[PDB]
């Protein structure tokens, strides 16, 4: 059998300036997917006029999204990260506040070193659902470095 569980997953987000030491996401949401990423597209194809095929490279962002429980310390840290304008930081040949998410998936030890990226979108205020229970908050980051997976 293959264990494809998700319990025990931890995330460590380290930002260049906002959180140089970094924070840890462990409290993930129950209604929304704790981690969700759209399919990477690093290749493209074009049709030649003789029916042939040509294959080339494209620029492939990695848009990841993490869902956290409303009101938790991870949610507060992510909101603090969201509310940090890029124009208030010193600039280097790198990226405005370069933030990397070390993802430790399960006791399998799968470590993902998604880096060279930044947060993009998230909820500013908590939305109260019809049921009366605040919706889990999904924050989306984008990355340009998507290698480092082990085991």
């Amino acid at each position: 059998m293959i264990n494809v569980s998700g319990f025990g997953t931890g995330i460590v987000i380290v930002s260049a300036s906002s959180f140089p030491m970094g924070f840890s996401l462990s409290k993930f949401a129950d209604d929304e997917s704790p981690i969700s990423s759209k399919e990477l597209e690093p290749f493209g194809y074009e049709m030649l006029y003789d029916g042939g095929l040509f294959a080339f490279d494209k620029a492939a962002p990695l848009e990841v999204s993490v869902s956290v429980i409303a009101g938790s310390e991870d949610d507060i840290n992510l909101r603090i990260l969201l509310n940090s304008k890029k124009g208030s930081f010193r600039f280097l040949p790198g990226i405005i506040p370069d933030m990397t998410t070390l993802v430790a998936t399960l006791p399998d030890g799968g470590r993902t070193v998604l880096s060279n990226g930044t947060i993009i979108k998230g909820p500013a205020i908590d939305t109260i659902q019809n049921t009366g229970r605040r919706k889990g908050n999904t924050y989306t980051f984008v990355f340009g470095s998507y290698l480092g997976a082990q085991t």
């Binding site: 304008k85 890029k86 124009g87 405005i96």
Partner: protein, 81 residues
């Protein structure tokens, strides 16, 4: 300027136009559209020389030698010194 985009070296290039754009879609950075145009030259490859003695001579045409006043005594004192 020499523009090297992707293994595509371009020499003798000068900026013809340039346009900045400031919009609420980019509040930190500013998009900019630059346009360069190559300076057409009669000889793409010129011939030079190593040592400083052997140029081909360049002619200055008619000059209309301008006028100064120093008298010959001043020139003589200058040559003496």
């Amino acid at each position: 300027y020499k523009v090297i985009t992707r293994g595509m070296v371009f020499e003798r290039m000068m900026c013809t136009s340039e346009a900045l754009n400031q919009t609420p879609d980019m509040i930190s950075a500013t998009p900019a559209r630059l346009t360069f145009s190559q300076v057409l030259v009669q000889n793409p490859k010129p011939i030079m020389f190593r040592n400083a003695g052997d140029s081909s001579m360049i002619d200055r045409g008619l000059a209309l030698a301008e006028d100064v006043v120093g008298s010959a005594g001043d020139l003589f004192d200058y040559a003496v010194n």
